Design an enzyme around this catalytic site. Structure first.
Site, PDB file in Angstrom:
ATOM      1  N   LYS A 177     -10.186  -9.429 -33.093  1.00 40.18           N
ATOM      2  CA  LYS A 177      -9.328 -10.589 -32.913  1.00 40.18           C
ATOM      3  C   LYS A 177      -8.634 -10.758 -34.244  1.00 40.18           C
ATOM      4  O   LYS A 177      -9.310 -10.852 -35.289  1.00 40.18           O
ATOM      5  CB  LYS A 177     -10.182 -11.803 -32.618  1.00 40.18           C
ATOM      6  CG  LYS A 177      -9.423 -13.075 -32.331  1.00 40.18           C
ATOM      7  CD  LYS A 177     -10.416 -14.211 -32.329  1.00 40.18           C
ATOM      8  CE  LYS A 177      -9.848 -15.416 -31.638  1.00 40.18           C
ATOM      9  NZ  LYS A 177     -10.864 -16.480 -31.710  1.00 40.18           N
ATOM     10  N   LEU A 216      -5.498  -5.794 -26.136  1.00 36.31           N
ATOM     11  CA  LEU A 216      -6.290  -6.193 -24.995  1.00 36.31           C
ATOM     12  C   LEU A 216      -5.886  -7.559 -24.497  1.00 36.31           C
ATOM     13  O   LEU A 216      -6.189  -7.929 -23.409  1.00 36.31           O
ATOM     14  CB  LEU A 216      -7.725  -6.217 -25.413  1.00 36.31           C
ATOM     15  CG  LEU A 216      -8.231  -4.893 -25.894  1.00 36.31           C
ATOM     16  CD1 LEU A 216      -9.663  -5.056 -26.369  1.00 36.31           C
ATOM     17  CD2 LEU A 216      -8.082  -3.849 -24.773  1.00 36.31           C
ATOM     18  N   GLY A 269      -5.530 -14.148 -26.696  1.00 33.89           N
ATOM     19  CA  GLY A 269      -6.488 -15.208 -26.363  1.00 33.89           C
ATOM     20  C   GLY A 269      -5.943 -16.526 -26.884  1.00 33.89           C
ATOM     21  O   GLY A 269      -4.723 -16.631 -27.118  1.00 33.89           O
ATOM     22  N   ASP A 320     -15.365 -23.858 -22.608  1.00 33.73           N
ATOM     23  CA  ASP A 320     -14.264 -23.286 -21.856  1.00 33.73           C
ATOM     24  C   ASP A 320     -14.679 -22.102 -20.995  1.00 33.73           C
ATOM     25  O   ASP A 320     -14.036 -21.056 -20.987  1.00 33.73           O
ATOM     26  CB  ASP A 320     -13.144 -22.891 -22.812  1.00 33.73           C
ATOM     27  CG  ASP A 320     -11.756 -22.840 -22.090  1.00 33.73           C
ATOM     28  OD1 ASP A 320     -11.566 -23.455 -20.978  1.00 33.73           O
ATOM     29  OD2 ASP A 320     -10.887 -22.132 -22.609  1.00 33.73           O
TER      30      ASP A 320
HETATM   31  C1  LIG Z   1     -10.826 -14.074 -24.350  1.00 36.31           C
HETATM   32  C2  LIG Z   1     -10.148 -12.684 -24.528  1.00 36.31           C
HETATM   33  C3  LIG Z   1      -8.790 -12.523 -24.580  1.00 36.31           C
HETATM   34  C4  LIG Z   1      -8.261 -11.253 -24.756  1.00 36.31           C
HETATM   35  C5  LIG Z   1      -9.067 -10.123 -24.895  1.00 36.31           C
HETATM   36  C6  LIG Z   1     -10.453 -10.283 -24.917  1.00 36.31           C
HETATM   37  C7  LIG Z   1     -11.432  -9.172 -24.972  1.00 36.31           C
HETATM   38  C8  LIG Z   1     -11.162  -8.168 -24.048  1.00 36.31           C
HETATM   39  C9  LIG Z   1     -12.085  -7.100 -24.059  1.00 36.31           C
HETATM   40  N1  LIG Z   1     -12.051  -5.998 -23.269  1.00 36.31           N
HETATM   41  C10 LIG Z   1     -11.010  -5.648 -22.446  1.00 36.31           C
HETATM   42  C11 LIG Z   1     -10.987  -4.448 -21.757  1.00 36.31           C
HETATM   43  C12 LIG Z   1      -9.796  -4.421 -21.061  1.00 36.31           C
HETATM   44  N2  LIG Z   1      -9.173  -5.591 -21.344  1.00 36.31           N
HETATM   45  C13 LIG Z   1      -7.884  -5.977 -20.777  1.00 36.31           C
HETATM   46  N3  LIG Z   1      -9.901  -6.324 -22.192  1.00 36.31           N
HETATM   47  N4  LIG Z   1     -13.182  -7.097 -24.862  1.00 36.31           N
HETATM   48  C14 LIG Z   1     -13.467  -8.081 -25.707  1.00 36.31           C
HETATM   49  N5  LIG Z   1     -14.506  -8.250 -26.525  1.00 36.31           N
HETATM   50  C15 LIG Z   1     -14.303  -9.399 -27.219  1.00 36.31           C
HETATM   51  C16 LIG Z   1     -13.129  -9.976 -26.764  1.00 36.31           C
HETATM   52  C17 LIG Z   1     -12.596 -11.225 -27.232  1.00 36.31           C
HETATM   53  N6  LIG Z   1     -12.175 -12.230 -27.602  1.00 36.31           N
HETATM   54  C18 LIG Z   1     -12.587  -9.164 -25.775  1.00 36.31           C
HETATM   55  C19 LIG Z   1     -10.961 -11.562 -24.705  1.00 36.31           C
END
Ligand SMILES: Cc1cccc(-c2cc(Nc3ccn(C)n3)nc3[nH]cc(C#N)c23)c1
EC number: 2.7.11.1
Length: 261
Positions: A36, A13, A16, A121
């Site tokens: 994560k 996803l 970060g 942030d």
């Molecule tokens: C800060 C950050 C960086 C990268 C990914 C995520 C992130 C992206 C995501 N859903 C989705 C659904 C589709 N895409 C692309 N992303 N859901 C999440 N739940 C906790 C997350 C955390 N940290 C997170 C959060």
């Protein structure tokens, strides 16, 4: 039930601040969550703050597993991705969608502040959407406690993302935590309504920030913003953090309480 503890890592996803985030699906239940993954002080702090979080506009923490060097942090998935991806460059989004997201961001930020946590942030990449477009504040890597046993501590560490950071963090040795988070919510709102950031950073040498202090709202991004949400921005993006509007007062603002489509 055998196997209910196993998760299949399906796709990334994103990366970060610290480490990659992956989509994880339960082998038995088919529950879809985010994990994560961190190849390991800093992260003991994050886990601690993450376990405190219980609110509908904040990402929920489900637990962690260490596998040797690697830590796995299991969190609520936001299946709708980021607010960053709903913001159209140079346009933004419809005013009623922005208002609803703004109401939801304030609810989350009220919550954090009430348990004495500052996020530090806030920006559209860290503001995530669930299946019903409910907003969730994510990423607690920079978060810190600013209130404990009912005593406030002042912050001094400079962090965040420059276009989102309050000017006191560039100018003063110490500053209050809450108005920093308020300020960044104002830049977020500007981004939602105009599809662009008003300045590279809020410093005396940035001509776009000077223009704002001289009230030149016939220029962009301000020209694209209706007068009612703009009057709220005029109270948020106030350089003196002691004079800046607080969240209780944002909640009484006229645009904040305007019924919209
Ligand atoms: C800060 C950050 C960086 C990268 C990914 C995520 C992130 C992206 C995501 N859903 C989705 C659904 C589709 N895409 C692309 N992303 N859901 C999440 N739940 C906790 C997350 C955390 N940290 C997170 C959060």
């Amino acid at each position: 039930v055998p196997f209910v503890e196993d998760w299949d890592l399906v796709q990334t996803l994103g990366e970060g601040a610290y480490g990659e985030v992956q989509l994880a699906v339960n082998r038995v239940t088919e529950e879809a969550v985010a994990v994560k993954i961190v190849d390991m002080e800093n992260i003991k702090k994050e886990i601690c703050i993450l376990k405190m979080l219980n609110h509908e506009n904040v990402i929920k923490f489900y637990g962690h597993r260490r596998e040797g060097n690697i830590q796995y942090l299991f969190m609520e998935l936001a299946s709708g991705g980021s607010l960053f991806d709903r913001i159209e460059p140079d346009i933004g989004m419809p005013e009623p969608d922005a208002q609803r997201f703004f109401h939801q961001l304030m609810a989350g930020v009220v919550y954090l502040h009430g348990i004495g946590i500052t996020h530090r942030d806030i920006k559209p990449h860290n503001l995530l959407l669930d299946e019903r477009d409910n907003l969730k504040i994510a990423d607690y890597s920079l978060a810190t406690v600013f209130r404990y046993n009912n005593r406030e501590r002042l912050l001094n560490k400079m962090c965040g993302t420059l276009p989102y950071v309050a000017p006191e963090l560039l100018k003063r040795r110490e500053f209050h935590a809450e108005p920093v988070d308020v300020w960044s919510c104002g830049i977020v709102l500007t981004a939602m309504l105009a599809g662009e950031l008003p300045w590279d950073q809020p410093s005396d040498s940035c001509q776009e920030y000077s223009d704002w202090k001289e009230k030149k709202t016939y220029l962009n991004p301000w020209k694209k913003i209706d007068s009612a949400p703009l009057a709220l921005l005029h109270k948020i993006l106030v350089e003196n953090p002691s004079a800046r509007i607080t969240i209780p007062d944002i909640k009484k603002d006229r645009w904040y309480n305007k019924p919209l489509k």
